[PDB]
Design a protein around this nucleic acid. Structure first.
Lengths: 57, 49, 300, 207
RNA sequence: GCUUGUGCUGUCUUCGUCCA
């Protein structure tokens, strides 16, 4: 989530974060709910866009 | 399971005469045994057999 | 200083936002906060920011060295000589500044790195410094018999697994509770397992992956308080068997390690997790040793 | 070695919810999930299974007199601000008032002392990005009409110069797509531009 | 807060329906 890259053995990883749709929830700047796979565009900065892969915090 | 409804079946898995049925409803309930998986890990008897 | 990449990428949520516009930060105070300087260096290496070291009294040193070097003549020839000397001195300063800046930067980097190294060493030592749990009416260092109960998640269809280990460190018996943990049947079966089979565990550990485990912990504590399940003491206020939460980084890593699979080829993953919890309670140091390489991935 | 270390309330909370006490405390905004709507309160669930509740004073704005059920329904997640945290019982109270969910922007406690913080640079960058936000794009208008011609004011006047008195040309207006400038030849080398305001427009290019 | 259930053979043979 920080933006860095790491290399670790498969054993060292804790576990997959299995999250239900009731847990993986995203809210945009305006407050409209955005779900998995939707396309959003960055409001500022590079103003890039893409499809959501996973939502965390 | 089939996408129909099983609520018209009796205790023995057979529908009773006089019951109105529609398409895709289940009139005979039958199950075949399957070797259980490793779900006995932490399933409280709720594992598919 | 900020590059265009720094001008665009340093967001209010990014960790680099703490020094987006820092200025005139004292060097002597940096050693007390090594992580700030390390993060500044990391941001610099990303092509976002530029770290600059400057002296408020640089002009004072330049003027003093010029006064030492300059001639005292007043003729126009002496004026030209002094001008040549001053210009060469300024060029020498221009050449010299970057090397001194780099040397000072490397010195501060080494100091901060050593400080953070010592800090991490102390944190790890604090993490791994804990003797095994001492049961009452026993001397310190005695290995207690432990019982671990866990169900993992608590979704509809989550049975509670129980694993008991003696002081010898060898698994004695594993049991499954397939009824609901809130039913009277669950409590009765757990009481029968605790009492009838002469298991007599010295401490009971409870752990899980979410908040659902809290309800199990409360239910177990209520059961212990209700049935007066006092510890058996080898031959009189008999003491109750303690029920606590257990830290489970080593247990989580052990449930995925192939060492457990070789040790227990016919056991579920939750059984391995409970065994790891029990071994951690018996001896945290040996469990931390069992991590081998994965210990370096722990949050220290 | 020291005796076995027993976890405390903060450690148990961090172990169970995997959320630090710093990242979950007063004055934080989280996208909680509505689980039950009632007239006097709403029961919501956070991402980390932490059950929350809001008393009726905060689900709806103090000025509004609507019903909680009409505005918010089950499955409609909304932003909420943490008011209180029961770490031992994993219970929290939230507020939907916009004074918290919106005004809380600079939630960081970074010391902005001018001696060690360049406030002027951050402010200047702030108006730079705000002006960038103000920047937009515009395009030309296309209209289908026999007497409509996409010409400037001087271009329309020159086009009407070769024509006798009274001929009429139509061009887009500078006051907006909802306005139309009509140029007609009053006299030799004399032209009048008249602005026409459009109402009930079906489209920008439409009439 | 207890939360809803998605999948079907194949190969022969016969007897039919509408044109022809």
């Amino acid at each position: 989530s920080d933006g860095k890259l790491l290399s670790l053995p498969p054993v060292s990883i804790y576990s997959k974060l299995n999250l239900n749709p009731n847990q993986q929830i995203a809210i945009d700047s305006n407050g409209v709910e955005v779900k998995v796979g939707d396309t959003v565009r960055e409001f500022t900065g590079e103003r890039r866009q893409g499809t959501i892969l996973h939502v965390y915090r | 399971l089939k996408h129909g409804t099983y609520e018209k079946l009796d205790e023995d898995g057979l529908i009773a005469p006089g019951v109105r049925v529609s398409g895709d409803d289940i009139i005979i309930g039958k199950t075949t045994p399957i070797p259980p998986d490793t779900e006995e890990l932490g399933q409280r008897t709720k594992y598919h057999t | 200083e900020l590059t265009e990449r720094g001008k665009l990428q340093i967001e209010p949520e990014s960790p680099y936002f703490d020094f987006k516009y820092a200025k005139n930060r004292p060097i002597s105070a940096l050693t007390a906060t090594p992580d700030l300087y390390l993060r500044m260096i990391q941001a610099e290496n990303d092509g976002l920011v530029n770290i600059k070291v400057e002296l408020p009294m640089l002009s004072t040193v330049v003027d003093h060295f010029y006064n030492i070097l300059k001639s005292d003549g007043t003729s126009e020839i002496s004026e030209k000589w002094n001008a040549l000397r001053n210009d060469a001195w300024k060029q020498s300063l221009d050449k010299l500044i970057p090397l001194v800046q780099l040397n000072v930067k490397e010195s501060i980097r080494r100091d901060c790195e050593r400080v953070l190294y010592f800090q991490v060493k102390n944190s790890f030592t604090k993490k791994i410094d804990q003797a095994p749990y001492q049961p009452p009416t026993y001397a310190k260092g005695t290995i207690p018999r432990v019982l671990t109960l866990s169900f993992g998640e608590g979704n509809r269809g989550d049975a509670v697994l129980g694993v008991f280990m003696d002081d010898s460190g060898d698994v004695k018996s594993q049991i499954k509770f397939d009824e609901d943990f809130q039913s009277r049947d669950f409590s009765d079966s757990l009481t029968r397992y605790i009492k009838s089979n002469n298991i007599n565990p010295d401490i009971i550990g409870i752990s899980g992956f979410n908040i659902h485990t809290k309800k199990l912990f409360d239910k177990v504590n209520e059961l212990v308080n209700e049935e007066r399940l006092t510890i058996e003491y080898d031959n009189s206020d008999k003491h109750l068997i303690r029920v606590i939460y257990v830290n489970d980084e080593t247990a989580r890593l052990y449930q995925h390690s192939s060492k457990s699979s070789a040790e227990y080829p016919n056991r579920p993953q939750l059984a391995k997790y409970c065994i790891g919890l029990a071994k951690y309670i018996q001896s945290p140091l040996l469990e931390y040793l069992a991590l081998d390489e994965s210990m370096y991935s722990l949050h220290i | 070695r020291r005796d076995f270390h027993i976890l405390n309330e903060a450690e148990i909370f961090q172990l169970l919810t995997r959320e630090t006490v710093d990242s979950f405390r007063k004055g934080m905004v989280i996208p909680v999930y509505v689980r039950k709507v009632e007239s006097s309160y709403m029961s919501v669930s956070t991402q980390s299974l932490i059950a929350g509740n809001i008393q009726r004073q905060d689900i709806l704005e103090p000025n509004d007199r609507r019903d909680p059920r009409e505005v918010y329904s089950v499955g409609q997640t909304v932003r909420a601000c943490i008011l209180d945290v029961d770490y031992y019982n994993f219970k929290c109270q939230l507020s939907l008032l916009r004074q918290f969910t919106e005004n809380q922007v600079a939630g960081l406690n970074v010391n902005r002392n001018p001696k060690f913080w360049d406030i002027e640079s951050e402010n200047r960058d702030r108006q730079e990005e705000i002006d960038k936000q103000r920047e937009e794009s515009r395009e030309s208008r296309v209209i289908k009409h026999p007497f409509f011609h996409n010409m400037k004011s001087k271009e329309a006047e020159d086009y009407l110069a070769a024509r006798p008195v009274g001929d009429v040309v139509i061009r887009p207006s500078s006051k907006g797509s909802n306005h139309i400038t009509i140029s007609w030849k009053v006299a030799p080398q004399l032209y009048q531009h008249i602005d026409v305001l459009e109402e009930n427009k079906d489209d920008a290019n439409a009439i």
